[PDB]
Design a protein around this ligand. Structure first.
Ligand SMILES: CNc1nc(Cl)nc2c1ncn2Cc1ccncc1
Length: 160
C-alpha cells in the first residue's frame, strides 16, 4: 500500500541530488549514507532541523532516470567515493545518515508532467545538485516511483 509512504511524505521537504556516477549511489544504497558539497551540506543541515522529513531524490547524471529516494536520519558528521575530475575528498567530508524509502528507478519520461515552482516551473528532472523541490511536486514525484516491497516504513516512521 501507499498510506505509510504518504504519511512519511507529509509536510516533507524535498531536494534533488545529482550524482556524477552510479558507484556513489550504489554505495549510498549499501551503506545508508550520503555526502555532498559544502554549499548543499549547509542547506540540508538547516532543512533537517526545519521539517519532519527531508527527502533526497537521487539522479545519476546522463542516466535519464532517478535511482530512488531516501529520508535524512541525521545532520552531517565527520567512505570510498569515486570523485569527479578535479573533485577532491575534503569537499565531500560531511556524511549524512539516510534511510531509503525506494531503491527502484523512475525514468524521466514518467515525470514529464511535473514542474518545480522553485526552478522556474521547469520539469522536475531539471536542476542542479541540491535544488529544492516544492512540496506538491516532490510528493507527486515520489508517488510515481514503483513500490519497493523490500522496505518497511515502520522503522522510518519511528525515527520521526
Ligand atoms: C558522494 N557525493 C557525491 N558523489 C558524486 Cl560522484 N557526485 C556528487 C556528490 N555530491 C554532489 N555531486 C555532484 C557534484 C556537482 C559539482 N561538483 C562535484 C560533485
Amino acid at each position: 500500500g501507499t498510506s505509510k509512504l504518504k504519511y512519511v511524505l507529509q509536510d516533507a521537504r524535498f531536494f534533488l541530488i545529482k550524482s556524477n556516477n552510479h558507484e556513489n549511489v550504489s554505495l549510498a544504497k549499501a551503506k545508508g549514507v550520503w555526502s555532498t558539497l559544502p554549499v548543499n551540506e549547509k542547506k540540508l543541515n538547516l532543512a533537517f532541523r526545519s521539517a519532519r522529513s527531508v527527502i533526497l531524490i537521487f539522479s545519476v547524471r546522463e542516466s535519464g532516470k532517478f535511482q530512488g529516494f531516501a529520508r535524512l536520519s541525521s545532520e552531517s558528521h565527520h567512505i570510498h567515493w569515486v570523485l569527479p575530475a578535479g573533485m577532491s575528498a575534503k569537499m565531500l567530508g560531511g556524511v549524512f545518515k539516510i534511510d531509503w524509502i525506494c531503491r527502484r528507478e523512475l525514468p524521466f519520461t514518467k515525470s514529464a508532467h511535473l514542474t518545480n515552482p522553485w526552478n522556474e516551473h521547469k520539469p522536475v528532472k531539471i536542476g542542479r545538485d541540491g535544488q529544492e523541490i516544492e512540496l506538491e511536486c516532490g510528493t507527486q514525484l515520489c508517488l510515481l516511483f514503483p513500490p519497493d516491497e523490500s522496505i518497511d516504513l515502520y522503522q522510518v516512521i519511528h525515527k520521526m
